[PDB]
Structures are given as C-alpha cells and as structure tokens.
Amino acid sequence: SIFIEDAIKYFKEKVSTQNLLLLLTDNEAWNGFVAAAELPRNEADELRKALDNLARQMIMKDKNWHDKGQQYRNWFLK
Amino acid sequence: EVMLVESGGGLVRPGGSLKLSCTASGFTFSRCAMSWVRQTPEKRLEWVSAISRDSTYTYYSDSVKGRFTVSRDNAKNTLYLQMSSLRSEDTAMYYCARQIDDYYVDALDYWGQGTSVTVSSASTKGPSVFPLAPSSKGGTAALGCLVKDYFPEPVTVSWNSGALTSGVHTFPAVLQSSGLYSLSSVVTVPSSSLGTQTYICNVNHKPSNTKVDKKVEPK
Amino acid sequence: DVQITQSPSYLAASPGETITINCRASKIISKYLAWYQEKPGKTIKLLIYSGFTLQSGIPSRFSGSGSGTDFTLTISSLEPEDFAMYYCQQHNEYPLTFGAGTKLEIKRTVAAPSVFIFPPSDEQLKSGTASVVCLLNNFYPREAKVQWKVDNALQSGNSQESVTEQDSKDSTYSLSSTLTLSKADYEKHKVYACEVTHQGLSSPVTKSFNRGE
C-alpha cells in the first residue's frame, strides 16, 4: 500500500492522462513497463488495479469537462 | 511436442570453465523466456539464471552472479550458460526450462532431461572390484561385489552377464573423502546353489572405458 | 529472496487414497505458486501454476488451493503413477525459489530386514585397506539404525550408508553400511559386528564374524 500510494502521486503529475492510458491499455506496453521496473507480479497486479481507478478518475474529469462545456454553451443560447 | 536437450556438461576442475547449451524444439524459441535450473546431489532444486525472449534482460542467482553468463541464439534455437570459476558446490544436474508467457517472470512449463556437471580435482579412474563372499553360516544366502575408488559417476553392474536380475540390488554410490566414488552390488540366491552355480559380477565404467569381471565364490 | 517451507517431507499412502502437500512462502506472493512432479527417467513436469490452474493434460486427480502465504496441493484417488517426488515453487519474482520437496511413497506392511555381514577380501587387504560391509535387505519402513562394533567398541565416523529407492515389486528398501579401516587397524582386532535396529525386529539383530575364521 505504501508503494501504491507513492505510485499514485508519480502518475498524477509527471505522467499525463494521455500517456497513462497508452500504458494501461496495451498489454505489450504494460509488460515492458513492469519488467523495466523489476516488479514482483503481485505488486504489478496491485499497481494496474490502482492505476485503473486513477485513469477512470481522470476520465471522469474529462467527461465532466465535455458535459459542463456543453451546458455552459446551452445556457448562453437562451 | 516441446523438446529441450541440454549438452556441454561433463568433468571440470575447480576454477575451470564450461559452456552449456540447450537446443529447443517443437515451438518458436524466439517467443519464449528461458531459465536455467540445477539439482544438487542432495536433490535440492536451485534456480540459477534466466533470459528474456530477446535477451533484453538477464537474471542470475547470488550464488552464481559474476561467474555465469546466460545468452541465446534465436536463429539456432539454442540457449547457453557460460560457467566460469567453477566451485565444487556447482556440481549438479543442469536443466534448461521454458517459462510460461503470462509475466516476464513465470512458472516453468517444460524442462529438459538435463546435463550433468561434476566439479572435482580427481582424475578419471576405473574401479577396483572386490568380492562380497557368501557366508559359510536350505535357505537363501547373500553375495555381491564391492566397486571401489572410481571417478566419475556412473558404473553399471550386471550379474552373470544379465542372466541374473532377480533379487539384485545395486546401491547408489557414495563419495568418499578421497574424492572417489564407491558402491556395492548384492544379490540373494539359494544356499543350495552355492558351489554349483558360478556367480560373476560385470562392472562397466564408460568414462575410463573400463570393464571388470569378478567371480564371487565362498572363501 | 522468498523462502519456501514445504511440508511434509515424506508421505506414505495407498492407491485410491487422498493426500495433501503444503507450502508456505516467507512473504505474500499473491497466487503465483507452482507445483512440479519428478519421476526417475522422466523430465520434471509442471502440474499446476498460478496456485490453482492445472496445466493442460494434467489429470483431475490434482487440484490446488491456498490462503495468504499458504498453498495446498491435493491428489485424490491416488494412482500408482502418482507416487513420486513433488516440489513447489513461487514464480512471483526473481530469483525463482523452490520448496525442499515431498517424497510420496507406497504404504505397506512392516518388514524386517535380512542382515548379512561381509569381511574384506584378501585382495583388498593387499592394497592396505579393509572394507567391511553390512547389508540390510528388503525392509519397511526406511528408518533403520546400523551400529558397527569392533571388539565391542562402538565405531564412529568411519562408516558410510547407502539406501535404494522403493522396490517396484514389494515396495521395500535395502541398505548397505560400509566400514573402512586400514589393514593395520583391521588386524588389531578379532570380532567384527554390525547391530541393526528396526521396527520389524523385536530386539536388535547382530551379525558378526571373527577375522581369520
């Protein structure tokens, strides 16, 4: 959990939401990443799971950004 | 069917070097990560090394780090293990093994039969064979042969040129402090057959190209 | 390194029965524990990987369970071919580490050994060495005590033991104990004896000879 909390911060600032998605999406890219990091498999599983939520949380911001922006427009039309 | 065949094993002196090779068949070798595992004379399994499918990453155990080098030639479907500064503790059966492809480190789904490596100062030497005479004391008597002071392993023992197989026990060899091996081969026969039936143990030691026949009779 | 404690070391069972083998990792490794079978003359075989997933072609007699650091291999409805050596192994991280193994042997009735003593040959004595051999033939279980005595003096540190694997037919063991002495030391004494203690014997059996007779 310590390693997970630390990892969450790292992927929030240094890694962009766009970059985070390419990693999480492609199995080939994830394998190369966990191998370079020399992660035990259990930690790799924990990391992907924790990162899935972070991505979803950032996509919720973008989906809300698209929705708020439409309502932002629709209000000015009246 | 997946097939792994090790070679390059054999006799080496302390401080010496050996290069093992493992030819892979029945699958696309370039697609799979490989491991080297060894089993000591104490029958303890010990992982030694590993290499990724494209040699991007190599891995070693602490007991072996800095002395062994794993490599591979995907074109020739061959895995290698260059062993240097060999110690007596490196004496073992060496297996190569294919890893499952779920994670960069994974279980080993296929193994080779293995190649034997013996690290010793001893020179190749054929055995001395001595009789284990049947006791002078309508039942069953025991007799055999003592196969002493040979190197390296194995010795094959037969009785009456293979005609006698029932009741035979050829024991595993023990390594003496002299650095030479020794074992016994015994057989239980009817007491009535003593004096009538001749009993000969045939000892073969391929490493020295030696063959010994020894007749065993009551003293 | 992940240290793995495999238990029990030995198991005696009969065909048709069920047994279990346990393995505990020194740290949490999720499910990534593998089980291997070793038989003589055969390559080592993967039975189960990732704790509970059977490898293709492995019989349904085998199954894997676990909790936390602990893992369990089940073999039910045992067949004769299932009696072999078993090893566990974590594949969560490098270095791969193995349990010390479990030997699954065939259970049978207690059988006492037939004991024989062999003096050294004259041919060997000419080389300056004396080997005295004591044979324990066809006994079960494997646990046995061999005690060398030279003129009633208990010998120590000058013998080596060797034991066969279970006999394919009667599932017994055989054992050889070899006492090594110099020609000089050998000729200092008269009575050479080896005392055998085993479950199948009411009291220890001693086989002996007198040097020169």
Side-chain angles (χ1 to χ4, degrees):
Chain A
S1 72
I2 315 105
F3 127 78
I4 289 161
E5 290 170 30
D6 185 15
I8 277 166
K9 294 177 184 179
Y10 196 94
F11 272 90
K12 264 179 177 176
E13 51 225 28
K14 293 185 180 295
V15 185
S16 191
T17 57
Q18 199 183 290
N19 294 114
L20 206 152
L21 250 64
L22 266 69
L23 185 82
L24 231 54
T25 302
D26 181 24
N27 271 21
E28 211 183 293
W30 178 256
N31 286 328
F33 160 72
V34 297
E38 306 203 279
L39 295 182
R41 197 167 170 182
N42 73 308
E43 282 178 21
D45 295 341
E46 269 178 281
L47 184 60
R48 204 174 185 158
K49 192 177 153 183
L51 269 39
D52 286 343
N53 280 291
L54 214 164
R56 285 168 193 166
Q57 280 176 5
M58 293 307 293
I59 273 152
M60 281 295 268
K61 277 171 66 63
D62 273 313
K63 195 161 110 175
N64 289 342
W65 187 264
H66 181 268
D67 295 329
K68 279 168 186 172
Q70 195 198 304
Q71 290 177 298
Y72 182 77
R73 288 178 207 174
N74 283 133
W75 187 85
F76 280 116
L77 286 168
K78 284 185 177 180
Chain B
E1 176 187 318
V2 177
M3 196 58 45
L4 300 170
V5 185
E6 304 89 339
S7 59
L11 306 179
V12 64
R13 301 181 69 80
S17 293
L18 275 184
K19 189 167 189 180
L20 308 183
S21 68
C22 168
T23 178
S25 197
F27 69 102
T28 303
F29 181 67
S30 60
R31 286 184 67 262
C32 304
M34 300 294 295
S35 272
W36 284 101
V37 177
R38 67 181 174 188
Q39 183 168 186
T40 69
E42 296 79 32
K43 282 187 47 52
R44 171 177 80 266
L45 284 175
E46 187 184 352
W47 174 88
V48 177
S49 189
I51 182 164
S52 67
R53 65 175 89 97
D54 53 344
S55 311
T56 304
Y57 302 94
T58 56
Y59 310 88
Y60 302 98
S61 60
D62 291 316
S63 55
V64 134
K65 191 191 176 198
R67 293 188 304 120
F68 294 10
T69 304
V70 64
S71 63
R72 61 151 85 210
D73 189 332
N74 280 342
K76 296 193 178 177
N77 313 290
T78 306
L79 173 72
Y80 303 103
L81 187 64
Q82 176 63 60
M83 309 188 292
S84 299
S85 302
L86 281 159
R87 306 167 187 160
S88 75
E89 314 90 67
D90 295 314
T91 295
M93 182 68 78
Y94 283 75
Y95 315 95
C96 55
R98 189 183 87 172
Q99 302 191 356
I100 294 173
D101 210 39
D102 298 336
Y103 198 67
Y104 74 86
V105 55
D106 220 323
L108 312 173
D109 57 4
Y110 284 99
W111 300 57
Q113 200 67 256
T115 192
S116 176
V117 175
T118 303
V119 188
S120 179
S121 300
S123 301
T124 300
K125 186 190 174 293
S128 293
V129 187
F130 305 112
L132 298 169
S135 181
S136 299
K137 291 186 272 186
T140 71
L143 58 92
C145 272
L146 175 63
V147 185
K148 227 192 117 64
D149 297 338
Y150 64 91
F151 184 86
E153 286 261 73
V155 286
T156 68
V157 187
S158 62
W159 284 92
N160 293 351
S161 292
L164 178 57
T165 56
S166 173
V168 177
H169 291 297
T170 302
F171 293 93
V174 297
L175 183 59
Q176 304 166 110
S177 55
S178 59
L180 303 174
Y181 293 91
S182 184
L183 69 76
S184 288
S185 184
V186 301
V187 58
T188 45
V189 303
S191 297
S192 60
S193 69
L194 305 174
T196 310
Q197 174 73 247
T198 297
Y199 293 102
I200 301 169
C201 73
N202 329 111
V203 183
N204 253 113
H205 189 237
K206 186 175 179 186
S208 60
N209 202 34
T210 275
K211 208 261 183 160
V212 182
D213 297 312
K214 182 62 63 179
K215 177 175 155 64
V216 188
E217 31 168 53
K219 293 179 179 179
Chain C
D1 301 20
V2 183
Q3 181 272 325
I4 292 149
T5 306
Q6 183 171 353
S7 61
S9 302
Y10 295 91
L11 262 168
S14 304
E17 291 182 349
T18 302
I19 60 96
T20 57
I21 305 170
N22 304 295
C23 279
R24 172 172 288 174
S26 61
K27 59 162 284 208
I28 292 289
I29 54 164
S30 182
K31 61 183 148 157
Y32 304 116
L33 191 288
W35 290 99
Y36 298 93
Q37 186 191 64
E38 186 189 34
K39 301 182 82 185
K42 301 271 172 283
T43 60
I44 292 161
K45 299 299 193 305
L46 174 66
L47 303 168
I48 290 169
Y49 67 95
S50 291
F52 332 110
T53 306
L54 271 74
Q55 178 73 350
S56 184
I58 300 301
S60 298
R61 295 191 303 277
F62 300 85
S63 69
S65 58
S67 181
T69 57
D70 297 349
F71 295 79
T72 301
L73 176 69
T74 302
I75 317 176
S76 62
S77 305
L78 284 166
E79 292 289 333
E81 54 269 20
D82 298 334
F83 293 81
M85 202 74 192
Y86 292 90
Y87 296 94
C88 57
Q89 176 221 64
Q90 67 82 22
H91 55 99
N92 187 60
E93 56 196 273
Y94 286 125
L96 299 177
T97 48
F98 298 84
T102 299
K103 184 180 264 175
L104 178 58
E105 66 179 11
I106 286 278
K107 203 156 61 189
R108 61 148 288 154
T109 53
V110 180
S114 321
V115 186
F116 307 89
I117 188 167
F118 299 101
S121 59
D122 293 323
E123 187 191 349
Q124 190 191 14
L125 282 198
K126 286 187 171 194
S127 73
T129 309
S131 298
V132 199
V133 179
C134 190
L135 166 65
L136 285 61
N137 209 49
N138 302 341
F139 60 97
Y140 184 94
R142 187 178 38 247
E143 204 282 309
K145 186 189 172 189
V146 185
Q147 183 84 61
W148 282 102
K149 289 175 209 174
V150 184
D151 290 334
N152 280 64
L154 265 69
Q155 300 305 283
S156 199
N158 57 2
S159 63
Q160 298 184 277
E161 280 189 3
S162 179
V163 194
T164 56
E165 290 303 287
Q166 259 194 318
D167 182 81
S168 58
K169 289 175 186 176
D170 61 27
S171 307
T172 61
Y173 301 94
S174 289
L175 183 152
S176 76
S177 187
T178 308
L179 178 78
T180 308
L181 305 173
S182 61
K183 181 191 182 201
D185 276 14
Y186 175 70
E187 293 179 335
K188 282 176 179 180
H189 299 277
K190 184 191 177 78
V191 193
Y192 289 80
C194 65
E195 183 193 64
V196 174
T197 307
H198 189 263
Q199 196 189 330
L201 301 168
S202 297
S203 64
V205 170
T206 305
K207 293 294 174 162
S208 70
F209 67 86
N210 300 339
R211 179 186 58 84
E213 167 174 13

